[PDB]
Protein backbone atom coordinates (compact mmCIF):
# COMPACT_ATOMS: atom_id res chain seq x y z
CA UNK A 1 0.00 0.00 0.00
CA UNK A 2 3.16 2.16 -0.01
CA UNK A 3 2.30 4.65 -2.78
CA UNK A 4 5.77 6.24 -2.83
CA UNK A 5 6.13 9.08 -5.38
CA UNK A 6 9.18 9.89 -7.53
CA UNK A 7 8.25 12.45 -10.21
CA UNK A 8 9.20 16.06 -9.36
CA UNK A 9 9.90 18.93 -11.80
CA UNK A 10 13.22 19.58 -13.59
CA UNK A 11 14.78 23.09 -13.85
CA UNK A 12 15.73 24.30 -17.36
CA UNK A 13 18.01 27.10 -16.10
CA UNK A 14 18.86 29.45 -13.19
CA UNK A 15 19.73 33.12 -13.81
CA UNK A 16 22.77 33.65 -11.54
CA UNK A 17 21.45 37.05 -10.39
CA UNK A 18 18.25 36.31 -8.37
CA UNK A 19 17.32 35.27 -4.71
CA UNK A 20 17.39 31.64 -6.01
CA UNK A 21 21.11 32.09 -6.72
CA UNK A 22 23.19 30.13 -4.17
CA UNK A 23 20.11 28.14 -3.01
CA UNK A 24 18.72 26.43 -6.16
CA UNK A 25 20.73 25.14 -9.17
CA UNK A 26 19.92 23.70 -12.60
CA UNK A 27 19.11 19.95 -12.56
CA UNK A 28 17.50 20.22 -9.11
CA UNK A 29 14.09 18.53 -8.54
CA UNK A 30 11.44 20.19 -6.32
CA UNK A 31 9.10 17.78 -4.47
CA UNK A 32 6.69 20.07 -2.61
CA UNK A 33 6.14 23.73 -1.54
CA UNK A 34 4.29 24.86 1.65
CA UNK A 35 2.52 21.47 1.37
CA UNK A 36 0.38 23.11 -1.34
CA UNK A 37 -0.50 21.02 -4.43
CA UNK A 38 -3.22 20.83 -7.11
CA UNK A 39 -1.74 18.63 -9.87
CA UNK A 40 1.83 18.48 -11.41
CA UNK A 41 4.52 21.14 -11.99
CA UNK A 42 1.78 23.61 -12.99
CA UNK A 43 0.54 23.28 -9.39
CA UNK A 44 3.65 25.16 -8.26
CA UNK A 45 3.19 28.01 -10.74
CA UNK A 46 -0.23 28.44 -9.09
CA UNK A 47 1.24 28.78 -5.57
CA UNK A 48 3.91 31.40 -6.43
CA UNK A 49 1.17 33.21 -8.40
CA UNK A 50 -1.53 32.82 -5.69
CA UNK A 51 0.64 34.73 -3.16
CA UNK A 52 1.83 38.38 -3.07
CA UNK A 53 5.18 40.20 -3.25
CA UNK A 54 7.07 40.53 0.08
CA UNK A 55 5.55 37.26 1.32
CA UNK A 56 7.60 34.14 2.20
CA UNK A 57 7.73 30.54 0.86
CA UNK A 58 9.08 27.12 1.91
CA UNK A 59 10.43 24.96 -0.95
CA UNK A 60 11.02 21.18 -0.56
CA UNK A 61 13.74 19.97 -2.95
CA UNK A 62 16.63 17.46 -3.04
CA UNK A 63 19.98 18.29 -4.70
CA UNK A 64 21.30 14.89 -5.84
CA UNK A 65 20.69 12.27 -3.06
CA UNK A 66 20.46 14.70 -0.06
CA UNK A 67 17.18 16.36 1.02
CA UNK A 68 17.59 20.16 1.38
CA UNK A 69 15.08 22.89 2.36
CA UNK A 70 15.30 26.66 1.86
CA UNK A 71 12.99 29.69 2.01
CA UNK A 72 13.35 32.88 -0.11
CA UNK A 73 11.58 36.26 0.00
CA UNK A 74 9.26 36.84 -2.96
CA UNK A 75 10.27 39.43 -5.59
CA UNK A 76 8.78 40.97 -8.75
CA UNK A 77 9.92 39.20 -11.97
CA UNK A 78 7.42 40.14 -14.71
CA UNK A 79 5.86 43.49 -15.57
CA UNK A 80 2.64 42.34 -13.83
CA UNK A 81 4.62 42.12 -10.57
CA UNK A 82 4.05 38.34 -10.30
CA UNK A 83 5.65 36.94 -7.05
CA UNK A 84 8.39 34.36 -7.80
CA UNK A 85 12.10 33.91 -8.49
CA UNK A 86 13.52 34.10 -12.07
CA UNK A 87 13.74 30.51 -13.36
CA UNK A 88 12.23 28.25 -16.07
CA UNK A 89 10.86 24.73 -15.42
CA UNK A 90 10.53 21.81 -17.90
CA UNK A 91 7.20 20.34 -19.02
CA UNK A 92 7.61 18.78 -22.47
CA UNK A 93 8.68 21.37 -25.08
CA UNK A 94 6.12 20.83 -27.90
CA UNK A 95 4.20 23.91 -29.14
CA UNK A 96 2.40 24.39 -25.78
CA UNK A 97 -0.61 26.35 -27.11
CA UNK A 98 -4.18 25.13 -26.62
CA UNK A 99 -5.61 28.33 -28.13
CA UNK A 100 -4.63 31.48 -26.19
mmCIF file of N, CA and C in Angstrom:
data_model
loop_
_atom_site.group_PDB
_atom_site.id
_atom_site.type_symbol
_atom_site.label_atom_id
_atom_site.label_comp_id
_atom_site.label_asym_id
_atom_site.label_seq_id
_atom_site.Cartn_x
_atom_site.Cartn_y
_atom_site.Cartn_z
ATOM 1 N N UNK A 1 0.862 -1.216 0.000
ATOM 2 C CA UNK A 1 0.000 0.000 0.000
ATOM 3 C C UNK A 1 0.885 1.248 0.000
ATOM 4 N N UNK A 2 2.206 1.042 -0.008
ATOM 5 C CA UNK A 2 3.159 2.157 -0.007
ATOM 6 C C UNK A 2 3.176 2.833 -1.380
ATOM 7 N N UNK A 3 2.381 3.902 -1.521
ATOM 8 C CA UNK A 3 2.296 4.653 -2.782
ATOM 9 C C UNK A 3 3.382 5.733 -2.819
ATOM 10 N N UNK A 4 4.644 5.300 -2.802
ATOM 11 C CA UNK A 4 5.770 6.237 -2.835
ATOM 12 C C UNK A 4 5.810 6.950 -4.185
ATOM 13 N N UNK A 5 6.059 8.266 -4.156
ATOM 14 C CA UNK A 5 6.131 9.081 -5.380
ATOM 15 C C UNK A 5 7.590 9.291 -5.771
ATOM 16 N N UNK A 6 7.821 9.653 -7.033
ATOM 17 C CA UNK A 6 9.179 9.893 -7.527
ATOM 18 C C UNK A 6 9.117 10.563 -8.899
ATOM 19 N N UNK A 7 8.404 11.693 -8.962
ATOM 20 C CA UNK A 7 8.250 12.454 -10.210
ATOM 21 C C UNK A 7 8.075 13.939 -9.900
ATOM 22 N N UNK A 8 9.200 14.623 -9.657
ATOM 23 C CA UNK A 8 9.199 16.059 -9.360
ATOM 24 C C UNK A 8 9.178 16.859 -10.655
ATOM 25 N N UNK A 9 9.801 18.047 -10.624
ATOM 26 C CA UNK A 9 9.895 18.934 -11.799
ATOM 27 C C UNK A 9 11.357 19.319 -12.015
ATOM 28 N N UNK A 10 11.819 19.255 -13.263
ATOM 29 C CA UNK A 10 13.218 19.579 -13.586
ATOM 30 C C UNK A 10 13.339 21.082 -13.896
ATOM 31 N N UNK A 11 14.510 21.660 -13.592
ATOM 32 C CA UNK A 11 14.777 23.092 -13.848
ATOM 33 C C UNK A 11 15.558 23.221 -15.159
ATOM 34 N N UNK A 12 15.076 24.080 -16.065
ATOM 35 C CA UNK A 12 15.732 24.296 -17.361
ATOM 36 C C UNK A 12 16.990 25.162 -17.197
ATOM 37 N N UNK A 13 16.891 26.179 -16.335
ATOM 38 C CA UNK A 13 18.012 27.099 -16.105
ATOM 39 C C UNK A 13 17.783 27.979 -14.878
ATOM 40 N N UNK A 14 18.885 28.549 -14.365
ATOM 41 C CA UNK A 14 18.857 29.447 -13.195
ATOM 42 C C UNK A 14 19.691 30.695 -13.496
ATOM 43 N N UNK A 15 19.035 31.857 -13.539
ATOM 44 C CA UNK A 15 19.725 33.119 -13.813
ATOM 45 C C UNK A 15 20.542 33.516 -12.578
ATOM 46 N N UNK A 16 21.866 33.344 -12.657
ATOM 47 C CA UNK A 16 22.766 33.646 -11.539
ATOM 48 C C UNK A 16 22.773 35.147 -11.205
ATOM 49 N N UNK A 17 21.620 35.647 -10.766
ATOM 50 C CA UNK A 17 21.449 37.051 -10.392
ATOM 51 C C UNK A 17 20.026 37.231 -9.842
ATOM 52 N N UNK A 18 19.610 36.302 -8.961
ATOM 53 C CA UNK A 18 18.252 36.315 -8.365
ATOM 54 C C UNK A 18 18.296 35.685 -6.952
ATOM 55 N N UNK A 19 17.316 35.915 -6.073
ATOM 56 C CA UNK A 19 17.320 35.273 -4.711
ATOM 57 C C UNK A 19 17.620 33.754 -4.771
ATOM 58 N N UNK A 20 17.172 33.094 -5.844
ATOM 59 C CA UNK A 20 17.393 31.645 -6.009
ATOM 60 C C UNK A 20 18.886 31.317 -6.133
ATOM 61 N N UNK A 21 19.683 32.299 -6.541
ATOM 62 C CA UNK A 21 21.113 32.087 -6.716
ATOM 63 C C UNK A 21 21.784 31.746 -5.385
ATOM 64 N N UNK A 22 22.479 30.606 -5.363
ATOM 65 C CA UNK A 22 23.195 30.132 -4.166
ATOM 66 C C UNK A 22 22.347 29.156 -3.352
ATOM 67 N N UNK A 23 21.057 29.036 -3.711
ATOM 68 C CA UNK A 23 20.111 28.138 -3.005
ATOM 69 C C UNK A 23 19.657 27.009 -3.935
ATOM 70 N N UNK A 24 19.199 27.385 -5.139
ATOM 71 C CA UNK A 24 18.722 26.425 -6.159
ATOM 72 C C UNK A 24 19.686 26.452 -7.352
ATOM 73 N N UNK A 25 19.827 25.297 -8.012
ATOM 74 C CA UNK A 25 20.725 25.139 -9.170
ATOM 75 C C UNK A 25 20.059 24.270 -10.232
ATOM 76 N N UNK A 26 20.472 24.463 -11.482
ATOM 77 C CA UNK A 26 19.920 23.701 -12.596
ATOM 78 C C UNK A 26 20.107 22.193 -12.373
ATOM 79 N N UNK A 27 19.080 21.411 -12.724
ATOM 80 C CA UNK A 27 19.114 19.947 -12.564
ATOM 81 C C UNK A 27 18.479 19.524 -11.243
ATOM 82 N N UNK A 28 18.134 20.501 -10.399
ATOM 83 C CA UNK A 28 17.497 20.215 -9.108
ATOM 84 C C UNK A 28 16.040 19.817 -9.332
ATOM 85 N N UNK A 29 15.489 18.979 -8.433
ATOM 86 C CA UNK A 29 14.088 18.530 -8.538
ATOM 87 C C UNK A 29 13.321 18.937 -7.281
ATOM 88 N N UNK A 30 12.257 19.738 -7.447
ATOM 89 C CA UNK A 30 11.444 20.193 -6.317
ATOM 90 C C UNK A 30 10.336 19.165 -6.088
ATOM 91 N N UNK A 31 10.113 18.792 -4.824
ATOM 92 C CA UNK A 31 9.100 17.779 -4.473
ATOM 93 C C UNK A 31 7.795 18.431 -4.043
ATOM 94 N N UNK A 32 7.884 19.402 -3.128
ATOM 95 C CA UNK A 32 6.687 20.075 -2.610
ATOM 96 C C UNK A 32 7.014 21.494 -2.115
ATOM 97 N N UNK A 33 5.984 22.342 -2.015
ATOM 98 C CA UNK A 33 6.137 23.726 -1.541
ATOM 99 C C UNK A 33 4.996 24.009 -0.561
ATOM 100 N N UNK A 34 5.312 24.532 0.636
ATOM 101 C CA UNK A 34 4.291 24.857 1.650
ATOM 102 C C UNK A 34 3.192 23.782 1.767
ATOM 103 N N UNK A 35 3.485 22.571 1.299
ATOM 104 C CA UNK A 35 2.519 21.470 1.369
ATOM 105 C C UNK A 35 1.345 21.710 0.425
ATOM 106 N N UNK A 36 1.440 22.768 -0.390
ATOM 107 C CA UNK A 36 0.375 23.114 -1.345
ATOM 108 C C UNK A 36 0.575 22.353 -2.661
ATOM 109 N N UNK A 37 -0.520 21.783 -3.178
ATOM 110 C CA UNK A 37 -0.504 21.017 -4.428
ATOM 111 C C UNK A 37 -1.893 21.045 -5.051
ATOM 112 N N UNK A 38 -1.954 20.820 -6.363
ATOM 113 C CA UNK A 38 -3.220 20.829 -7.106
ATOM 114 C C UNK A 38 -3.148 19.841 -8.274
ATOM 115 N N UNK A 39 -1.928 19.575 -8.765
ATOM 116 C CA UNK A 39 -1.735 18.627 -9.872
ATOM 117 C C UNK A 39 -0.238 18.265 -10.030
ATOM 118 N N UNK A 40 0.408 18.762 -11.102
ATOM 119 C CA UNK A 40 1.826 18.478 -11.408
ATOM 120 C C UNK A 40 2.672 19.743 -11.212
ATOM 121 N N UNK A 41 3.658 19.958 -12.085
ATOM 122 C CA UNK A 41 4.522 21.139 -11.991
ATOM 123 C C UNK A 41 3.686 22.418 -12.012
ATOM 124 N N UNK A 42 2.659 22.442 -12.865
ATOM 125 C CA UNK A 42 1.776 23.606 -12.986
ATOM 126 C C UNK A 42 1.209 24.001 -11.619
ATOM 127 N N UNK A 43 1.069 23.019 -10.727
ATOM 128 C CA UNK A 43 0.539 23.282 -9.386
ATOM 129 C C UNK A 43 1.411 24.305 -8.659
ATOM 130 N N UNK A 44 2.718 24.244 -8.904
ATOM 131 C CA UNK A 44 3.649 25.161 -8.259
ATOM 132 C C UNK A 44 3.449 26.570 -8.779
ATOM 133 N N UNK A 45 3.373 26.702 -10.107
ATOM 134 C CA UNK A 45 3.191 28.014 -10.738
ATOM 135 C C UNK A 45 1.976 28.708 -10.106
ATOM 136 N N UNK A 46 0.997 27.903 -9.698
ATOM 137 C CA UNK A 46 -0.228 28.440 -9.088
ATOM 138 C C UNK A 46 0.042 28.998 -7.687
ATOM 139 N N UNK A 47 0.913 28.330 -6.925
ATOM 140 C CA UNK A 47 1.238 28.783 -5.567
ATOM 141 C C UNK A 47 1.990 30.123 -5.582
ATOM 142 N N UNK A 48 3.073 30.180 -6.355
ATOM 143 C CA UNK A 48 3.906 31.395 -6.434
ATOM 144 C C UNK A 48 3.069 32.548 -7.001
ATOM 145 N N UNK A 49 2.043 32.205 -7.787
ATOM 146 C CA UNK A 49 1.167 33.214 -8.399
ATOM 147 C C UNK A 49 -0.033 33.535 -7.497
ATOM 148 N N UNK A 50 -0.380 32.618 -6.584
ATOM 149 C CA UNK A 50 -1.530 32.816 -5.686
ATOM 150 C C UNK A 50 -1.157 33.693 -4.489
ATOM 151 N N UNK A 51 0.149 33.903 -4.276
ATOM 152 C CA UNK A 51 0.636 34.729 -3.158
ATOM 153 C C UNK A 51 0.883 36.156 -3.634
ATOM 154 N N UNK A 52 1.542 36.957 -2.783
ATOM 155 C CA UNK A 52 1.828 38.378 -3.068
ATOM 156 C C UNK A 52 3.306 38.695 -2.796
ATOM 157 N N UNK A 53 3.786 39.780 -3.400
ATOM 158 C CA UNK A 53 5.183 40.203 -3.247
ATOM 159 C C UNK A 53 5.465 40.594 -1.792
ATOM 160 N N UNK A 54 6.653 40.220 -1.300
ATOM 161 C CA UNK A 54 7.067 40.527 0.083
ATOM 162 C C UNK A 54 6.742 39.367 1.017
ATOM 163 N N UNK A 55 5.934 38.429 0.529
ATOM 164 C CA UNK A 55 5.552 37.256 1.319
ATOM 165 C C UNK A 55 6.769 36.366 1.534
ATOM 166 N N UNK A 56 6.530 35.123 1.966
ATOM 167 C CA UNK A 56 7.600 34.140 2.198
ATOM 168 C C UNK A 56 7.123 32.769 1.728
ATOM 169 N N UNK A 57 8.064 31.894 1.356
ATOM 170 C CA UNK A 57 7.734 30.540 0.861
ATOM 171 C C UNK A 57 8.726 29.512 1.399
ATOM 172 N N UNK A 58 8.262 28.260 1.473
ATOM 173 C CA UNK A 58 9.081 27.122 1.910
ATOM 174 C C UNK A 58 9.094 26.091 0.782
ATOM 175 N N UNK A 59 10.264 25.902 0.167
ATOM 176 C CA UNK A 59 10.429 24.962 -0.954
ATOM 177 C C UNK A 59 11.026 23.652 -0.425
ATOM 178 N N UNK A 60 10.513 22.516 -0.926
ATOM 179 C CA UNK A 60 11.015 21.179 -0.561
ATOM 180 C C UNK A 60 11.689 20.638 -1.814
ATOM 181 N N UNK A 61 13.011 20.463 -1.783
ATOM 182 C CA UNK A 61 13.738 19.973 -2.954
ATOM 183 C C UNK A 61 14.961 19.186 -2.503
ATOM 184 N N UNK A 62 15.459 18.292 -3.362
ATOM 185 C CA UNK A 62 16.632 17.459 -3.041
ATOM 186 C C UNK A 62 17.701 17.613 -4.131
ATOM 187 N N UNK A 63 18.881 18.116 -3.751
ATOM 188 C CA UNK A 63 19.980 18.292 -4.704
ATOM 189 C C UNK A 63 20.795 17.004 -4.712
ATOM 190 N N UNK A 64 20.593 16.173 -5.734
ATOM 191 C CA UNK A 64 21.298 14.889 -5.837
ATOM 192 C C UNK A 64 20.595 13.795 -5.022
ATOM 193 N N UNK A 65 21.246 13.332 -3.936
ATOM 194 C CA UNK A 65 20.694 12.270 -3.058
ATOM 195 C C UNK A 65 20.387 12.795 -1.650
ATOM 196 N N UNK A 66 20.693 14.080 -1.388
ATOM 197 C CA UNK A 66 20.460 14.697 -0.058
ATOM 198 C C UNK A 66 19.249 15.643 -0.093
ATOM 199 N N UNK A 67 18.377 15.528 0.922
ATOM 200 C CA UNK A 67 17.178 16.364 1.017
ATOM 201 C C UNK A 67 17.532 17.705 1.670
ATOM 202 N N UNK A 68 17.306 18.788 0.921
ATOM 203 C CA UNK A 68 17.590 20.162 1.376
ATOM 204 C C UNK A 68 16.306 20.988 1.379
ATOM 205 N N UNK A 69 16.255 22.003 2.246
ATOM 206 C CA UNK A 69 15.083 22.888 2.357
ATOM 207 C C UNK A 69 15.554 24.324 2.547
ATOM 208 N N UNK A 70 14.953 25.240 1.788
ATOM 209 C CA UNK A 70 15.300 26.659 1.856
ATOM 210 C C UNK A 70 14.065 27.510 1.589
ATOM 211 N N UNK A 71 14.076 28.713 2.160
ATOM 212 C CA UNK A 71 12.988 29.690 2.006
ATOM 213 C C UNK A 71 13.577 30.996 1.493
ATOM 214 N N UNK A 72 12.893 31.612 0.515
ATOM 215 C CA UNK A 72 13.351 32.881 -0.107
ATOM 216 C C UNK A 72 12.217 33.910 -0.093
ATOM 217 N N UNK A 73 12.573 35.194 0.002
ATOM 218 C CA UNK A 73 11.578 36.262 0.002
ATOM 219 C C UNK A 73 11.127 36.494 -1.438
ATOM 220 N N UNK A 74 9.823 36.646 -1.626
ATOM 221 C CA UNK A 74 9.257 36.842 -2.955
ATOM 222 C C UNK A 74 9.700 38.189 -3.537
ATOM 223 N N UNK A 75 9.859 38.222 -4.866
ATOM 224 C CA UNK A 75 10.266 39.433 -5.589
ATOM 225 C C UNK A 75 9.496 39.532 -6.906
ATOM 226 N N UNK A 76 9.453 40.739 -7.471
ATOM 227 C CA UNK A 76 8.775 40.965 -8.755
ATOM 228 C C UNK A 76 9.699 40.525 -9.888
ATOM 229 N N UNK A 77 9.159 39.731 -10.816
ATOM 230 C CA UNK A 77 9.918 39.202 -11.970
ATOM 231 C C UNK A 77 9.380 39.783 -13.277
ATOM 232 N N UNK A 78 8.068 39.661 -13.480
ATOM 233 C CA UNK A 78 7.417 40.137 -14.711
ATOM 234 C C UNK A 78 6.759 41.494 -14.489
ATOM 235 N N UNK A 79 6.469 42.165 -15.593
ATOM 236 C CA UNK A 79 5.856 43.491 -15.571
ATOM 237 C C UNK A 79 4.599 43.538 -14.689
ATOM 238 N N UNK A 80 3.873 42.420 -14.620
ATOM 239 C CA UNK A 80 2.639 42.336 -13.831
ATOM 240 C C UNK A 80 2.957 42.121 -12.342
ATOM 241 N N UNK A 81 4.224 42.291 -11.965
ATOM 242 C CA UNK A 81 4.624 42.118 -10.565
ATOM 243 C C UNK A 81 4.171 40.767 -10.006
ATOM 244 N N UNK A 82 4.447 39.685 -10.745
ATOM 245 C CA UNK A 82 4.051 38.341 -10.304
ATOM 246 C C UNK A 82 5.060 37.816 -9.266
ATOM 247 N N UNK A 83 4.669 37.490 -8.044
ATOM 248 C CA UNK A 83 5.646 36.937 -7.054
ATOM 249 C C UNK A 83 6.313 35.644 -7.557
ATOM 250 N N UNK A 84 7.637 35.556 -7.391
ATOM 251 C CA UNK A 84 8.393 34.360 -7.800
ATOM 252 C C UNK A 84 9.803 34.701 -8.235
ATOM 253 N N UNK A 85 10.710 33.735 -8.076
ATOM 254 C CA UNK A 85 12.101 33.912 -8.494
ATOM 255 C C UNK A 85 12.153 33.877 -10.025
ATOM 256 N N UNK A 86 13.345 34.087 -10.609
ATOM 257 C CA UNK A 86 13.520 34.098 -12.071
ATOM 258 C C UNK A 86 14.152 32.808 -12.575
ATOM 259 N N UNK A 87 13.302 31.819 -12.838
ATOM 260 C CA UNK A 87 13.745 30.511 -13.357
ATOM 261 C C UNK A 87 12.719 29.964 -14.349
ATOM 262 N N UNK A 88 13.117 28.926 -15.096
ATOM 263 C CA UNK A 88 12.234 28.254 -16.067
ATOM 264 C C UNK A 88 12.253 26.745 -15.803
ATOM 265 N N UNK A 89 11.058 26.161 -15.687
ATOM 266 C CA UNK A 89 10.864 24.730 -15.424
ATOM 267 C C UNK A 89 10.589 23.993 -16.736
ATOM 268 N N UNK A 90 10.737 22.663 -16.707
ATOM 269 C CA UNK A 90 10.535 21.808 -17.898
ATOM 270 C C UNK A 90 9.182 21.104 -17.805
ATOM 271 N N UNK A 91 8.510 20.990 -18.951
ATOM 272 C CA UNK A 91 7.204 20.345 -19.021
ATOM 273 C C UNK A 91 6.884 19.996 -20.473
ATOM 274 N N UNK A 92 7.767 19.199 -21.073
ATOM 275 C CA UNK A 92 7.614 18.775 -22.465
ATOM 276 C C UNK A 92 7.541 19.995 -23.397
ATOM 277 N N UNK A 93 8.611 20.229 -24.165
ATOM 278 C CA UNK A 93 8.678 21.375 -25.080
ATOM 279 C C UNK A 93 7.396 21.512 -25.920
ATOM 280 N N UNK A 94 7.302 20.762 -27.026
ATOM 281 C CA UNK A 94 6.121 20.833 -27.901
ATOM 282 C C UNK A 94 5.798 22.297 -28.242
ATOM 283 N N UNK A 95 4.599 22.550 -28.774
ATOM 284 C CA UNK A 95 4.195 23.914 -29.143
ATOM 285 C C UNK A 95 3.546 24.630 -27.958
ATOM 286 N N UNK A 96 3.054 23.846 -26.983
ATOM 287 C CA UNK A 96 2.398 24.395 -25.775
ATOM 288 C C UNK A 96 1.492 25.586 -26.125
ATOM 289 N N UNK A 97 0.328 25.298 -26.708
ATOM 290 C CA UNK A 97 -0.607 26.355 -27.107
ATOM 291 C C UNK A 97 -1.972 25.756 -27.439
ATOM 292 N N UNK A 98 -2.835 25.674 -26.429
ATOM 293 C CA UNK A 98 -4.176 25.125 -26.616
ATOM 294 C C UNK A 98 -4.991 26.037 -27.534
ATOM 295 N N UNK A 99 -4.880 27.349 -27.314
ATOM 296 C CA UNK A 99 -5.610 28.330 -28.126
ATOM 297 C C UNK A 99 -5.090 29.745 -27.847
ATOM 298 N N UNK A 100 -5.099 30.142 -26.576
ATOM 299 C CA UNK A 100 -4.634 31.477 -26.192
ATOM 300 C C UNK A 100 -3.164 31.675 -26.575
#
